[PDB]
C-alpha cells in the first residue's frame, strides 16, 4: 500500500491555550500514526505557512514511520495575530510546551528553520529533558557576523516587503532569497502573495513589534555548553540573509555537533536538495 | 608661507605611450620638487579620477615635501579609451613603466586603490628594483572569498549602473559606497555626474571589455611571496564591494606587512578618516 | 554469506614502472571482482602502509561489490625508495596513471588522505577523463593557512620523529592525531614501530628530499576552478596537522562540493568514526 | 636636561585593600606628575611583573608627560598571595577601583595585556564614567576560538610550567613567546627564573585556583555593545596562546574600534616592536 499524499486542509486542527493571562488559538497539522514524533517549525517569511515550507519533506518522514507535527507559530498563518516586544523564541517555546502538554507526549524531535530554529534552541535550554534529537538550518543564534556586514541585504529586502506589500517586490525578494531561480514557479508566487495580502494584521503587528524592540533573537553564546543532546546543523554557503560564520559558532557550542555545507545552496536548503537533505536527516534519526 | 592647495589645471601634464603598437595619450599631475617621489593610482568607479579620490590626501604629502604624481589609467578621465581582452593590471603596469621611464626616476613609492592596487602589486612583482614601499587600500588580490558570497552585491550594482548610467542609480551606488551620508554633499554628486556625461566611450568600452572576458584581474597568490619591500595595508570592515577576508590573505604573504582596519568604514577609506589615514601613512613613510 | 576479510599476503601484487630513466617496483593490494574500481591512497605518516590506514573501511566497500586497489606510493612500505626534487603530487599522479594503464581500467573513483589527497587533486587536473568522483579526507590542497601559524606543531613533531626514531615519539604523535587516545592499543604501536624500523632508507630519502625543497606540495588555487567532477570533503575540527580553514578554501574551488565537518576529530578521520563515514561514502558513491 | 630613567626602588609603593572581608597588600609603581593618568596592567606569565613587561614602553610615556602607574595583580610580584575560585576579571576590577579611589583620579586610560586586558574590559562595564581611553593587547574576551583547537600550545605549556617549575621549560616558553629568540638575552632568563623561584606560594595558589575552577575568564560577548569610549586593539599574527579570531570579535563589539595587526610578532608584542607600538599609542592618546 503506497503512501497517499497529504493535504494541508485535511490535516488542519486548532487549539486554544491560555498564556500570560490571555487566550490564543494556534493552528497545527498532525499526520501519521507512528509512536515517535517529529516537530516542524516554519521560517519568518511573509505569509509563510508550515505546510508550505515543508512541502517536499513531509513524505519521507511519514513513510519512515515517524508521526509528524507541523506547528504554525503565533503571529503567522492561521494562528491568531499577536504583538510582542519580548523575545520571539521564548514565546514560541512556551507555546510549543503548551501544545505538547495538550498532546501529552514527553520526548520529541525538533527540526526548525530560521526563526523557529532559534526558538528550537531556546526550547532545549529551558526544558532540556524533553528533546531527543536536534536539527538546525540557517539559524540557532542571533548575533553579529564576523566577516559579512550586518544588516545583510536579504533582511533589508524583507523589511521592505513588510512595510509595503507588492508582487514585484516579492519577486525581488524571492530571486535574492533562492540561489537557483529556475526552479521557482508562478504557482508559489501567487499562493504566497494571496496568503500575505489576506492577513494584513500579521504584517502590521510584525512591523509594530520590530519597532518596539530592535532585537528579536538574543545572543545565546555563553549557554551553548549546557546542551547535551546530539545535534546536526545544515547550512548553505551562498545564503545571503544570514552569513555562514554564524553556523560555525554553533559548531563550537554543542559537544556532538556535525555540520554539513552545500556549495551552491540558498537560505531555503530543503527545496534546493530535497533528496540529499531528506536522506541525511532520515539516517540521522535512524542513527542509534 | 603655507603650501597652496594644488590645481589640476596648472599641474596638468600629458604623455605619449606606445602600447601594443598603438599610440595612446595619458593624463597625469605632478606636484613638488623633492628628491623622494610617490605615485597615486585611482579606483575602478564610474568616471573615477585620482583628483576626486585623493582631494584630502593631496595636501599633506606636498607639505611633507614628497614629490607626488597622480596617475590616470586609460579608460578613465582624459586618457584615451581602450578595450581590453586580457589582464587589465599588467596593461596598467606596462603604461606605468613607460611613464616612469620617461620620467626616469629610480626609487618610487606606490599607493594604489582597488583595481589600481592590483596594478601596484603586479608592478612590484616584475621590477622589485624600482619600488621602495607599498601602501594598499581596499584591494590588491583577485580571488574568491572564504565566507562572503560571490558575486558580491556591490559589483553587481556597479555593473548595472554601467549598463545604464543615471542619477538615481548613482544615488543608490553612492549610498551603498560610503558608510556615512551626513557629511556627503551635492557638489561631489554634480562633479561625478558631469564627468560621467562628458564621455560615454569609456562606459561602453568598459562594458564590452567586461562582457568579452568575465575576469580581468588575475590571481597573484602563489607568487606573492616574491615581494621583498616593506608594505602597509589599510582596509574597511563594513565594505561590501570587496570582503575583508581577501585583505587578510595579503597579510599572510609579505614578510613585513602590517594590517590596519577601521570598523565604521566602507570601500573608500581614505576620505572617511582623512586625519588618521594621513597620520598613519606619513608615519609609515618616514619610518627608516 | 559475507566473505571473510582478505589478507595482505594473498592480495599482494607487484608492478614495474620506469620514470626518468629509473626502474621502480610498486607494491600494492587488489581486492574484489566488481566492475567499479576505487583507488585508495596512503597517508603521509612515517611507516604507514596503505592497509594500515584503511583497515576498517575495506570490508564494507568490497562487500558492496566494489573492486578496490590500495596503492603504496614510492617511499613507503615495500615500494622502492626514491628521492624527488619535484612535487609529490605530479610524481604520484604519474605513477598511478602508469599502474592503472597496466591494469587497463577505464574509470576510477579516488579516495585520498593527506599526501595522496594532494596528488589526487593533481591527477584530476591533467587526466580529467579517468576520474569521475572525488573524495578527500583532511587534505588535497597546498598553500599556507590564513588563521593558523605555520609550521603547525603536528608537522614539527613529525619532522622531529623523522630525526629521532623512537617509541615515545610515536606515543606523542598518536597523542596529537586522535582526539581520544583510549581507543588505541599496544598492537598498533608495535606494528607501526617495527614497520618504520624495517626500512630506514625511506627515512633518509624523505629527509634529504626535504632539504631538496622546503615546500613539497604546491598550491592549486588559480587552477582550482578547472575541476568538473563532483566532490565530497571530510574534515576534522580539532585537527592540528592541517588547519580547518584550508578545507573551506577547497569548498570555494569545486563546482559542486560538499563539506562535512565533525566536532571532535583529528587528522585520522576514517578510523575514529567508522559507521558514519562508511555510510556517507557509500551513499555518495551510489548517488548519481 | 634629559629626563632621568626611572628606578623600581624609588617608585615602589604599597597600599592596602579590603576584599571579601580580608586585608590585602598591593605593590605598584608610580611615575610622572601629569594631571592625566594611565594605568598599566601586567600579563599572566609565571613570575612576570608589571615593570618587566613594560620596560621598553615606560620611558616614552613619561617623556610625553603623562602620569603612569604600573599595577601588580594579586598573586604576582610582591603583592599578597590569594586563591580565586571565582572569576579573576572582577577581582582585578575591584582591586583597581580601590587603588584608584585611594589615589583619587577622576579620569584614567587603561592599557592591558593578556589576562589584564580581560580585566580591563570588566572595569569599563562597571564604572564607564572613569575610563577615558582604552587599549588592548592580545585578549579581552573568553570563549572557544572558532578556527583553532583548545587548549592551545601556549596555555598547555603554561599549565605544565605551573605544575612543575624548571629552567628548560622556561627556555621552551620564551621560544614560544617570541618570533625570533636571537634578540632575547639570558639576563631576562635569569631574572624571570629567580623571580618565579623566589615565590612558590603564587605557583601553588595558581595551580589550586585552576584545579578548583576550570574556566577562569568568562565571556563578555552580549554586553560588548555597552562600551562607548574609543578603543585600540593591537595583536600579533603568529600568536599561539590565543588565536587571532578573538581580536576580530572585539572589532565587532566596540562601535569605534580600531584594529592593528603585525605580520611577524609573538604574544609579547610590545617588546618586539618598541618604536612602532610606542608611536601608535602616543598618536592614539593624543588624538582628541
Swiss-Prot record, chains A, B, C, D:
Active-site residues (renumbered): 267
EC number: 3.7.1.14
InterPro entries: AB_hydrolase_1, AB_hydrolase_fold, Epox_hydrolase-like, MhpC_alpha/beta_hydrolase
Entry's family note: Belongs to the AB hydrolase superfamily. MhpC family.
Pathway info: Aromatic compound metabolism; 3-phenylpropanoate degradation
Note: MhpC is not a serine hydrolase (catalytic triad), as Ser-114 is a non-nucleophilic catalytic residue and Asp-239 is not involved in the catalytic mechanism.
GO biological process, one term: 3-(3-hydroxy)phenylpropionate catabolic process
Keyword Transferase: no
Keyword line: Aromatic hydrocarbons catabolism, Hydrolase
The protein's enzyme class: hydrolase
Gene Ontology molecular function: 2-hydroxy-6-oxonona-2,4,7-trienedioate hydrolase activity; 2-hydroxy-6-oxonona-2,4-dienedioate hydrolase activity; hydrolase activity; protein homodimerization activity
Protein name: 2-hydroxy-6-oxononadienedioate/2-hydroxy-6-oxononatrienedioate hydrolase
Domain of life assignment: Bacteria
Result of changing residue 113 to A: 200-fold decrease in catalytic activity and almost 2-fold increase in affinity
Cellular component terms per the entry's GO annotation: cytoplasm
Described purpose of this protein according to its UniProt entry: Catalyzes the cleavage of the C5-C6 bond of 2-hydroxy-6-oxononadienedioate and 2-hydroxy-6-oxononatrienedioate, a dienol ring fission product of the bacterial meta-cleavage pathway for degradation of phenylpropionic acid. MhpC shows some selectivity for the carboxylate of the side chain.
Effect the entry attributes to changing residue 177 to D: 100-fold decrease in catalytic activity
Mutation effect (residue 44 to A): 2-fold decrease in catalytic efficiency and more than 5-fold increase in affinity for the natural substrate
Effect on the protein of changing residue 192 to K: 40-fold and 5-fold decrease in catalytic activity and affinity, respectively
Outcome following mutation: residue 177 to G: 4-fold and 8-fold decrease in catalytic activity and affinity, respectively
